Enzyme design. Structure first.
Site, mmCIF file in Angstrom:
data_model
loop_
_atom_site.group_PDB
_atom_site.id
_atom_site.type_symbol
_atom_site.label_atom_id
_atom_site.label_comp_id
_atom_site.label_asym_id
_atom_site.label_seq_id
_atom_site.Cartn_x
_atom_site.Cartn_y
_atom_site.Cartn_z
ATOM 1 N N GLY A 94 -62.586 53.256 -43.439
ATOM 2 C CA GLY A 94 -63.176 54.483 -42.929
ATOM 3 C C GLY A 94 -64.644 54.689 -43.255
ATOM 4 N N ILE A 95 -64.976 55.911 -43.664
ATOM 5 C CA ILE A 95 -66.334 56.265 -44.100
ATOM 6 C C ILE A 95 -66.792 55.391 -45.283
ATOM 7 C CG2 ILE A 95 -67.652 58.106 -45.310
ATOM 8 C CD1 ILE A 95 -66.077 60.076 -43.366
ATOM 9 N N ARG B 252 -56.916 49.875 -52.868
ATOM 10 C CA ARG B 252 -55.603 50.074 -53.487
ATOM 11 C C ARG B 252 -54.622 48.926 -53.201
ATOM 12 N NH1 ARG B 252 -52.220 54.819 -55.467
ATOM 13 N NH2 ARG B 252 -51.519 52.806 -56.327
ATOM 14 N N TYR C 203 -57.557 70.718 -51.295
ATOM 15 C CA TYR C 203 -58.759 70.020 -50.863
ATOM 16 C C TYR C 203 -60.016 70.880 -51.069
ATOM 17 C CZ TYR C 203 -56.219 66.032 -49.183
ATOM 18 O OH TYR C 203 -55.486 64.869 -49.133
ATOM 19 N N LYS D 155 -63.016 69.643 -53.654
ATOM 20 C CA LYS D 155 -64.352 69.411 -53.121
ATOM 21 C C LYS D 155 -65.383 70.302 -53.784
ATOM 22 C CE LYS D 155 -64.819 69.825 -48.688
ATOM 23 N NZ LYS D 155 -64.735 69.347 -47.280
ATOM 24 N N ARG E 18 -56.368 69.334 -28.348
ATOM 25 C CA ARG E 18 -56.741 70.745 -28.430
ATOM 26 C C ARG E 18 -57.507 71.151 -29.695
#
Ligand SMILES: [Cs+]
Lengths: 227, 211, 211, 227
Positions: A18-19, A39, A135, A139, A179
Site C-alpha cells: 500500500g502507502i 509480517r 483509530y 492517530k 456510494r
C-alpha cells in the site's frame, strides 16, 4: 542553494504494501538505503526486508539490529500504521497497541543511535480515512507522542513529524461502496482522492536535507479535507 | 514514482532581500522561471524584477501583466510579508500590507490559475504586536478560504510559518535559529509536483517553537 | 559523492531554434542562468537574448558584455553552428560562421574563465560538403588546442558531435534519428559538475553512426 | 525537458574496491538498484554482493542469476577491469583473459535479457594509467568489442560505451614513486590527477536516461591526456 543529497539508512515499517510500499519505493529511487518491515509475505525486489510485529518489543529490537548490520544504523524511520480498517475493549486495545504503542516501540528503539550520531528523522504516517474511536485515539495519540519526541530530541538534530493522509486510493477504499466513495468527495475541496505517490512525495521531503528545521509538525495530505 | 519536473512561471513578492531572496534564488536553481517584486532596492542579478507596493491594486495588476509578458502567466505565487516588525495607523498599515496585500496578489493571480487548471499560492508568514499577529492569522484564514474554493481546479493555497530565522533559543526545541535556506527548501517543496494533494496547510518552519 | 550543483552563467549561441533551443531550455530547467544569441528571430520566452552575427567580432564582444551585465560573466559557453547545410564564396562563408565564429566566441569568453579559474566551452558540431566537413573538423582541432592550453586553469573545451537529429537510417545502428532533447542531455552533462576531468573530448550523439 | 528518472537494476563488476566502489556508491545514490561483484572480501553495506571470477563463465552465469533473483534482470552492466598493474606469454594471456575475455563473458551473459526487454546499457571501464603491451591490447580490444556490440544491439535500445580513465588517484598510483607521480602530470593538460568520483560521474551519466543516443563511444576521463 539546495543542500547536497545524503544517502540515509531508512526503515519503513509496513513498507511491503500500500502507502508503505509507495513510500519505500520512492525513498529508494531518491537514493536512500531502504529497508522495510513486513509480517511474513516479504519485501519486494530491491528492498531489504525484516519480519516484525510492532506489538512485540523484542521483534522490533531484532529488526533494527538486522537493518543496522545490513545498511548501517537507522537514520530515517518511517512508521506506518500497523492496522487500518460497535466498538469494544478488545478492538480498542488492539488498535491502540498496534498503531500508538507500536509507534512508541519503533521510535524508542530508533532513538539512542539517532541521539548519539546527532541525526535523526522520525516520520509517522497516520492511518487513512475513513471502528471510529480507536483509530481516532491512536492517530491523535501518535501526534501527541511525536510532539513530545520533537521537544526532547530536536536539540540533537533528531526531529519527529507526522504525515496525516486523508482519503487515499488503496485496496480497502476501492472496496468501499461506490456510494461512499463518491460522497467522501463532498468533504474534499480537491474533489478527488489522493494517490499513494502523493503521500510518498511528502515523506520524501521530510526525509530530505530540506526538512531540517521542521519538527513537531503535522502535514495533512488530504486535498484540503481536514481544515 | 516521482512526478516529472515542470518549469513553472513563478512570482515571489519581496523577493529581493532576506527570506524572499533565498526563496527566489532556490526556485531559480530548481529550474523555474522566477520573477520577483520589490519596493525600490532592485531585483537580484539574473532575475526579472518589477517594482510593486502591495497596498496598490493597480501596481499589483501591472506587475502581473509585465511578468506574464516576460515569462508567461504566473503559475506559482509566493507572497512574502510586505512589512516586518498601538495606534490605529500602525495597525492599519500592517494589515493593509500584510493581509490585504496578500489578498491583492492572490486575487490577481487567481483568474489565470483557475482557467489553466493549475496554481500554487504559497503565503510566507512574518518572522517571530496585535497588528502582526492579526495579519499572520488572517492570511491563514484567507488561504484556507481560497483552498476551499479553488482546490477543485487544481489551485491550492498553503502557508509557510517561519519561526526565528536569521536574516530566545530557550523557546525553540532545536536550540538554534533557522536559516533563510531552510525556509526556501520548504517553499521549493510546495512549488513542486510532490505537493499536489496538500491544500489549506500551515507548515511551521520553526525548529519546534510554535508546536 | 555527487558534487553540489552550481548555477552557472550560461551563453548558448543560436539558442533560439532547433538543437540550440533545446539546449537552452534544458540548461535553464537544470538551474543555470541562461542567455542566448540569435540572428533576428528573437529569444525564447523567459530567457535573456542578444542579437549576434558570429562573423562580427565587435558584435560578439558587445553580446558578452550585455550578458555579463545581466547575469554575471559567462562561465559556460555553448557554441552552436552559425550555419546549417563548391565556390570560394560558399566555402569561406561556412568557414567564417562555423569555424572562425567558434573562435570569436571562444576567444571572448576565455579571459574571464581563466581569471576566475572556471570555464566550460562546449562546441556543437553541425548535423549530418567540403566546407561543412572542414569547419566541423576544424572546430575539433581548435577545441583541442584550447583544452591543451587552458585545462590547467580549470577551463575545458569539449565537442558534441550530433549525427542525424530531427529538428538514411540504414547507416545508423540505432535504426532511428535522434531528438534535440538527446543532444541537450549531453550538453547538460558537460555543463555539470560531473564533467570536470573531461577535456578535449568529442562525444558523438549519433546512435552509433560515425563510430 | 529532462527525461524522468528510472531506477535500473545495475551490476558493477569489481564494485567493492577503488574506482568500481566509487561507481557503485554513486549509482546507488542516483536511485538505482546496485549489485556488485567481488572476489571474496564482500560488498560494502547498502550494496548486494556476488562472488565471481570473470575468467569463469559458469561463475558469471550464477552471479547474474543471483542478481536477477534479488533485484530483477540486469539492465545496466558496468564492467570494470579485472586486473590493474619484461612481458611474457603467461602475463599477456592472464591480463587478456581477465580484462578482454572477462568483459566478453559479462556482456554476453547480460545480452539476451537486454535484447528481449529492449533496454540495455553496457558500460566498460578501461584500466587506469600507467606490463605495457598486455594492458594496451586488452583496453583497445574492449573498445573494438564494445563497438561490435553497439553495432549489433543498438537497434534493440541496447548500447555499449567505454569510459577511458587517465591517471586517477588510487592506492597503486599513490604507491608509485613520488617522482613518477609529479611527472605523469607533465602529460596531463589539467595538471592534476583525476578522482574516482570524477570517473563515477561519467558512469552515472552513461547509465542515465540522457545517454540514450550515445552508442559505440569512448569517453576519456583524463584531464586532456589522451588527445
Ligand atoms: Cs532557471
Amino acid at each position: 542553494a539546495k543542500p547536497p543529497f545524503v544517502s540515509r539508512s531508512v526503515l519503513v515499517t509496513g513498507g511491503n504494501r500500500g502507502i508503505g510500499l509507495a513510500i519505500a519505493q520512492r525513498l529508494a529511487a531518491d537514493g536512500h538505503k531502504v529497508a522495510v518491515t513486513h509480517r511474513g509475505s516479504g519485501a519486494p525486489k530491491g528492498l531489504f526486508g525484516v519480519e516484525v510485529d510492532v506489538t512485540d518489543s523484542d521483534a522490533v529490537d531484532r529488526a533494527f539490529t538486522a537493518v543496522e548490520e545490513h545498511q548501517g544504523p537507522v537514520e530515517v524511520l518511517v512508521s506506518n500504521a500497523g492496522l487500518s480498517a460497535r466498538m469494544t475493549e478488545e478492538k480498542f486495545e488492539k488498535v491502540i497497541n498496534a498503531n500508538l504503542t507500536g509507534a512508541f516501540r519503533v521510535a524508542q528503539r530508533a532513538s539512542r543511535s539517532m541521539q548519539r550520531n546527532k541525526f535523526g528523522r522520525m516520520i509517522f504516517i497516520g492511518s487513512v480515512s475513513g471502528n471510529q474511536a480507536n483509530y481516532a485515539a491512536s492517530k491523535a495519540g501518535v501526534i501527541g507522542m511525536a510532539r513530545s519526541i520533537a521537544r526532547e530530541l530536536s536539540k540533537a538534530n533528531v526531529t519527529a513529524n507526522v504525515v496525516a493522509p486523508g482519503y487515499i486510493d488503496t485496496d480497502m477504499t476501492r472496496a468501499l461502496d461506490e456510494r461512499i466513495q463518491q460522497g467522501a468527495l463532498q468533504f474534499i475541496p480537491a474533489k478527488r482522492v489522493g494517490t499513494p505517490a502523493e503521500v510518498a512525495g511528502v515523506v520524501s521531503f521530510l526525509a530530505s536535507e530540506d526538512a531540517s528545521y521542521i519538527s513537531g509538525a503535522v502535514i495533512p495530505v488530504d486535498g484540503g479535507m481536514g481544515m
